[PDB]
Every structure is written in C-alpha cells, then in structure tokens.
Motif scaffolding. Structure first.
Motif, PDB file in Angstrom:
ATOM      1  N   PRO A  22      -5.106 -15.550   0.031  1.00  0.00           N
ATOM      2  CA  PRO A  22      -4.456 -14.563   0.899  1.00  0.00           C
ATOM      3  C   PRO A  22      -2.985 -14.886   1.141  1.00  0.00           C
ATOM      4  O   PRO A  22      -2.275 -14.131   1.806  1.00  0.00           O
ATOM      5  N   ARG A  23      -2.532 -16.011   0.597  1.00  0.00           N
ATOM      6  CA  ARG A  23      -1.147 -16.433   0.755  1.00  0.00           C
ATOM      7  C   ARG A  23      -0.442 -16.503  -0.597  1.00  0.00           C
ATOM      8  O   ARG A  23       0.785 -16.437  -0.675  1.00  0.00           O
ATOM      9  N   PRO A  44       4.544  -3.851  -6.355  1.00  0.00           N
ATOM     10  CA  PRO A  44       3.547  -3.445  -5.360  1.00  0.00           C
ATOM     11  C   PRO A  44       2.718  -2.252  -5.823  1.00  0.00           C
ATOM     12  O   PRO A  44       3.256  -1.272  -6.336  1.00  0.00           O
ATOM     13  N   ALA A  45       1.405  -2.342  -5.639  1.00  0.00           N
ATOM     14  CA  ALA A  45       0.502  -1.268  -6.036  1.00  0.00           C
ATOM     15  C   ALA A  45       0.648  -0.061  -5.117  1.00  0.00           C
ATOM     16  O   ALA A  45       0.148   1.024  -5.416  1.00  0.00           O
ATOM     17  N   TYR A  74      -1.524  -5.771  -5.713  1.00  0.00           N
ATOM     18  CA  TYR A  74      -0.295  -5.985  -6.468  1.00  0.00           C
ATOM     19  C   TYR A  74      -0.483  -5.607  -7.934  1.00  0.00           C
ATOM     20  O   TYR A  74      -1.610  -5.502  -8.419  1.00  0.00           O
ATOM     21  N   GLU A  75       0.629  -5.406  -8.634  1.00  0.00           N
ATOM     22  CA  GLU A  75       0.587  -5.040 -10.044  1.00  0.00           C
ATOM     23  C   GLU A  75       1.474  -5.966 -10.873  1.00  0.00           C
ATOM     24  O   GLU A  75       2.701  -5.874 -10.827  1.00  0.00           O
ATOM     25  N   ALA A  94      -4.177  -6.904  -9.215  1.00  0.00           N
ATOM     26  CA  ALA A  94      -4.248  -7.996  -8.253  1.00  0.00           C
ATOM     27  C   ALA A  94      -5.055  -7.593  -7.024  1.00  0.00           C
ATOM     28  O   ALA A  94      -5.314  -6.411  -6.800  1.00  0.00           O
ATOM     29  N   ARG A  95      -5.450  -8.584  -6.230  1.00  0.00           N
ATOM     30  CA  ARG A  95      -6.229  -8.332  -5.024  1.00  0.00           C
ATOM     31  C   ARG A  95      -6.444  -9.620  -4.236  1.00  0.00           C
ATOM     32  O   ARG A  95      -6.673 -10.684  -4.815  1.00  0.00           O
TER      33      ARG A  95
END
Length: 104
Positions: A22-23, A44-45, A74-75, A94-95
C-alpha cells in the motif's frame, strides 16, 4: 516458445506482481532479446490528478515505485528499448490494498 534466433524484439509478456504494498508497487517481467534498456511509464488509471505521467528508464526488467497510496489503481507500460525503435507497449493493471482501519 522462442524458436531460438537473434533478430526480432519480443516485448515483455511475463508481467507479474512480485509484491503488493500500500506504500509501494513492485513489478517483474521477462527480459527482451536485443534491447539494452526498458522504458517505464507510470500513469494514473484515474483521470483525477494534476501531476502528469512519469517516465523513467531501468536496466532490469524489475521496477519498484516508492511512495504510493492505498487502494489506488495505476498503469505501468513497459517497452523493450534497444536504440532507434522499441518493442510494443505492454503494461499491467496495478493495484494495492488498504491499510489502517477498515470501515465496512
């Protein structure tokens, strides 16, 4: 499979998440044949945000983005750069989870 010849520049397909923090976000893919470096574009997604997409070059097929937010998509698009022209654009979705107190 790779017939076994040095000519074409096959992009990264073995894209897998090494770890989910998460960081920070860690990713790892397969190396290309011929390319000397890879272009990492972090975008950014979500259409929400002022700061544009980031563009960095790494020597290894593994990249880690430090300083992220929990529960944010994220992308990241990876490309096998060899010099004049690179390979096709191959990125993953991303996730990251959410730490702290969980209110339902």
């Amino acid at each position: 499979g790779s017939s076994g010849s040095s000519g074409p520049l096959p992009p990264p397909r073995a894209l897998t998440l090494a770890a989910v923090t998460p960081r920070t976000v860690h990713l790892t893919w397969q190396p290309s044949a011929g390319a000397t470096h890879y272009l990492v574009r972090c975008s950014p997604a979500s259409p929400k945000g002022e700061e544009e997409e980031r563009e960095v070059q790494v020597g290894r097929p593994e990249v880690l983005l430090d300083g992220l937010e929990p529960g944010r998509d994220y992308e990241v698009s990876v490309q096998s750069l060899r010099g004049p022209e690179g390979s096709e654009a191959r990125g993953i979705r991303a996730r990251t989870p959410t730490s702290g107190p969980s209110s339902g």
